[PDB]
Design a protein around this ligand. Structure first.
Ligand SMILES: [Mg+2]
Ligand SMILES: [Zn+2]
Lengths: 346, 378
């Protein structure tokens, strides 16, 4: 709850709305640059080191047996610890396309202040989901086994009913739940009667047996559902079992950022309350055994640049730190076009 | 003459009052005359259904974003893109050049009634406009860079049985009066994502029209039309970006051959064109997949510098200006090296070479009376 301005280096143009901040042993890695990889960083990943309120962007190379991936502007990342690695699905190709390939990003070597990734791809079989962005995927454990839970977001129109004047028009995907097994790349869709319409730009929180869906925006009605979801899942030896329940206590928030403050206790930051005005209130979620309670913070004061702007973005840095970005105001005509701040969660 | 509506009406009423007769035309007549020429007026059809393309034939200017996602929870973008439809623009251009092609086919000793198909070779071009800001003062507020996307019908050919004959050829292909614009937007040329999002519908329409058959009723009888597109109106800065290659830092310099900068200095003339769109897509797929599990340097020199995915089939070309300025820039240093007597001096100094340059410049200005300058031109 303490605002702090951060100065940027020379390669500031590589930051675009919808980046990715991965965490490995406390070290933060920036992914999802702007444009295409140049001659300096042929991969696209950087060390997001910050010293004396000044961030640097040192490139990171891949392994000899790795696979180079294009940057994504709205991917779906989940912390899969089963060593430590991440799983990226979805995204948006810089050529305004949607990829539906799973990228397994892991650290294979780290010595002499140099890291080395072993990014590989994995295909999907069975009930494969259509390419989409804005979705969120999590991993749940049951009976000692792990399984990936993914809730769809939005995507382009189907190729059959796609025209020229709506070549870029998108729509919310079908409200289905997909279970992806990373051991064999097997995907299985599940239909739930309580799901009414699609949802995009929501918050996904799970504690080892149930994924919580908070906030989000629906394009079909151009509103934000104020009802949270409780998806109790279980993986028996035979056929899987998934159940969903509706509970009061939702928050009309969209494009919010989620991070961890303490054990089984997270915090929601300001996203977008309405389509026109700016959201400033923030809430905190505290988990226990099966119940869940939400609460607010002590209204941390912001600067004049944040209150006078209209849009922003950002993500979390893993160790209870929110790194957000404010676009430069064209009225001043003397700015780097992207201001950046940090919040000490504590 | 760049005449506004108010001033034109003033001139019209003044001439009508001072002469008595109505020699000029009113404003509504001019509006009708300009609407009868805008795209989306004359009917047409296509033999294939042209999937993913609407069949409505009375549309003109449209938003170039083609159903954008300008919501607040989406990637921000501040551009104003206005465009015509490709088939509508082609039909409008054909209805415009109807009289010209009729006169041409009459002069070519052909019958007034003759169906197609008319092989229409069209040139494609795209280039920015630099600065278009109109801020008088208040300091340099914004650069406000603009960009356009236009086409130009290059030639029209028809056959009588088996023998072909060029029925229409443009007198000035690379001129300003033959630039038919498709789209106009305010975006930087280096801005890749917005440019791709704006140009994807046009590329889709072009690749869908590549294998279609237009049918028109311009000369009172049904006429069939084919099309052949050639994207040769791209400069080096854009052909090194839309094709997937590196912009300027790659060792590979030839946009047609895979010869490195080091091998180019040794092999001068013996080369061949070994680049195309399909092979570029294949090389990008190999770069992305990397099935051989090799190092970064060897993979880079195996993909020949391809790092980005191409999405526009381009046909690169050069002009005489760059060739002659390059030859002259080389011959200038050749003259410097031959006047400095370096073949006997293995290692010279930079100051000695500057003295050589100054002496050569003075000698040239005294004998040939020429003004030397580092800024080179044509
Ligand atoms: Mg140019
Ligand atoms: Zn060459």
């Amino acid at each position: 709850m303490s605002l702090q301005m951060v100065t940027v280096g020379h390669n500031i143009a590589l930051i675009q709305p919808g980046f990715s901040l991965m965490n490995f042993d406390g070290q933060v890695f920036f992914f999802g640059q702007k444009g295409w990889p140049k001659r300096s960083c042929p991969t696209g990943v950087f060390h997001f080191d910050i010293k004396q309120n000044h961030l640097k962007l040192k490139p990171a190379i891949f392994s000899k047996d790795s696979c180079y991936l294009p940057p994504l502007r709205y991917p779906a990342t989940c912390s899969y610890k089963g060593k430590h690695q991440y799983i990226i699905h979805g995204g948006k190709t810089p050529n305004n396309e949607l990829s539906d390939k799973i990228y397994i990003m892991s650290v294979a070597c780290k010595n002499n202040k140099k890291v080395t990734f072993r990014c590989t791809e994995k295909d999907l079989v069975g009930d494969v989901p259509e390419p989409r962005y804005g979705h969120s995927i999590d991993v749940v454990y049951s009976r000692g086994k792990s399984m990936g839970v993914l809730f769809g977001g939005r995507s382009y129109m189907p190729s059959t009913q796609r025209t020229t004047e709506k070549w870029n028009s998108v729509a919310d995907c079908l409200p289905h739940v997909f279970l992806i097994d990373f051991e064999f790349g097997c995907a299985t869709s599940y239909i739930l009667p309580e799901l009414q319409d699609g949802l995009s730009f929501h918050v996904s929180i799970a504690r080892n047996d149930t994924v919580y869906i908070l906030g989000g925006h629906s394009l079909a009605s151009n509103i934000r559902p104020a009802n949270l979801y409780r998806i109790r899942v279980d993986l028996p030896l035979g056929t899987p079992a998934v159940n969903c329940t509706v509970l009061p206590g939702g928050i009309s928030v969209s494009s919010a950022i989620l991070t961890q403050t303490n054990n089984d206790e997270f915090v929601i930051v300001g996203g977008y309350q309405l389509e026109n005005q700016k959201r400033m209130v923030c809430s905190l979620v505290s988990l226990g055994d099966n119940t869940i309670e939400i609460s607010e913070m002590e209204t941390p004061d912001w600067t004049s640049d944040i209150k006078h702007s209209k849009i922003w973005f950002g993500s979390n840095m893993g160790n209870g730190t929110i790194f957000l970005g404010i676009p430069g105001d064209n009225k001043q005509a003397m700015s780097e076009a992207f201001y950046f701040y940090t919040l000490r969660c504590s | 003459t760049f005449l506004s509506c108010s001033q034109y009406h003033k001139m019209y009423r003044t001439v009508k009052a001072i002469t008595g007769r109505q020699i000029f035309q009113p404003l509504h007549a001019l509006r009708n005359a300009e609407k009868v020429l805008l795209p989306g007026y004359h009917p047409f059809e296509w033999q294939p259904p042209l999937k993913n393309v609407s069949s409505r034939t009375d549309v003109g200017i449209i938003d170039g974003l083609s159903g954008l996602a300008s919501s607040v929870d989406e990637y921000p973008v501040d551009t104003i893109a206005k465009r015509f439809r490709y088939d509508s623009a082609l039909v409008s251009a054909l209805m415009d050049m109807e009289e010209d092609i009729l006169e041409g086919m009459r002069s070519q000793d052909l019958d007034d009634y003759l169906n197609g198909p008319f092989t229409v070779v069209v040139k494609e071009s795209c280039d920015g406009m630099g600065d278009v800001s109109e801020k008088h003062g208040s300091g340099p507020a914004v650069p406000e860079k603009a960009v356009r996307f236009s086409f130009t019908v290059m030639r029209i050919t028809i056959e009588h049985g088996s023998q072909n004959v060029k029925v229409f050829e443009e007198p000035k292909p690379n001129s300003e009066l033959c630039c038919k614009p498709l789209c106009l937007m305010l975006a930087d040329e280096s801005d890749h994502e917005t440019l791709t999002a704006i140009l994807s519908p046009l590329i889709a329409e072009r690749e869908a029209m590549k294998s279609s058959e237009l049918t028109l009723e311009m000369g009172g009888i049904p006429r069939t039309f084919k099309f052949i597109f050639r994207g040769t109106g791209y400069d080096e800065k854009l052909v090194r970006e839309v094709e997937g290659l590196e912009a300027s830092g790659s060792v590979y310099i030839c946009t047609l051959c895979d010869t490195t900068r080091l091998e180019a200095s040794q092999n001068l003339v013996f080369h061949s064109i070994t680049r195309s769109h399909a092979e570029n897509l294949q090389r990008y797929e190999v770069w992305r997949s990397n099935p051989y599990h090799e190092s970064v340097e060897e993979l880079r020199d195996r993909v020949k510098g391809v790092s980005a995915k191409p999405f526009i089939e381009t046909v690169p070309s050069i002009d005489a200006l760059h060739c002659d300025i390059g030859n002259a820039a080389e011959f200038y240093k050749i003259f410097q090296l031959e006047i400095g007597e370096v073949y006997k001096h293995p290692n010279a100094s930079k100051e000695e070479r500057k003295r050589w340059q100054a002496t050569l410049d003075k000698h040239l200005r005294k004998r040939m009376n020429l003004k030397p300058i580092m800024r080179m031109n044509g």
